[PDB]
């Protein structure tokens, strides 16, 4: 219907230049990314027949 | 009667080499590592750059 | 509707290694196979004319 549109904008320079406690500021942390690395283990199920 | 045994099919049991029988195997091999593919970009021939 | 799906899986090694009386176990027989071989007998019917 156009009432609710999707947008995305960058961060203002005044907030980006001073990030994570610059010029006496506080509680303005960076955003961080990491990798998880998790494993899956499978098992060999058997099968057999007789005559 | 030295039973070969198996893991209890529990993921931790397989990953730790545990086995309900006699011997305990070294490790659960390595079949490979999957990484999520980086999504592709749309290029900038739809919007002028003007650096 | 997907409520009743169709599956197929093997046997756990702990239950397949000891099948039909190993390590003192019992009441775990195998699954067996074989052939029947049944026969059909036909009869030669005759057919004739005269001039």
Distance from CA of A42 to the nearest CA of B (A): 8
C35 is written with which tokens? Answer: 């052939």
What CA–CA distances, in Å, run from C36 to A1, A49, C33, C39? 71, 18, 10, 10
Q: Which residue of A lies nearest to B33 if distances are taken between CA atoms?
A: A39
Distance CA B28, CA B2 (A): 22
User: Which of B38, B8, B36, B31 has its CA nearest to residue B20?
Assistant: B8
Give the SS3 label for residue A13.
helix
Angle (nearest 5°) at CA B14 between C23 and C9: 70
Q: Where are the alpha helices (DSSP H) in chain A?
A: 13-17
- Gap between the Cα atoms of C9 and A32, Å rounded: 43
Resolution (A): 3.3
Q: Which two tokens stand for residue A27?
A: 């509680």
Question: Which residues in chain B are contacts of A39 at CB distance < 8 A?
Answer: 15
**Is the Cα dihedral B18, B20, B25, B29 positive or negative?**
negative
Contact C14, B5 (CB under 8 A): yes
- At A3, list the tokens: 């009432």
């Amino acid at each position: 219907a156009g009432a609710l549109v999707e947008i995305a904008e960058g961060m203002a320079t005044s907030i980006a230049e001073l990030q994570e406690g610059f010029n006496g500021s506080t509680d303005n942390p960076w955003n961080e990314m990491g990798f998880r690395i998790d494993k899956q283990v499978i098992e060999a199920k058997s099968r057999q027949l007789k005559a | 009667a030295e039973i070969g045994g198996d893991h209890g099919y529990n993921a931790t049991n397989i990953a730790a080499g545990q086995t309900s029988g006699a011997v305990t195997q070294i490790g659960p091999a390595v079949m490979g590592m999957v990484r999520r593919a980086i999504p592709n970009l749309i290029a900038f021939d739809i919007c002028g750059v003007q650096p």
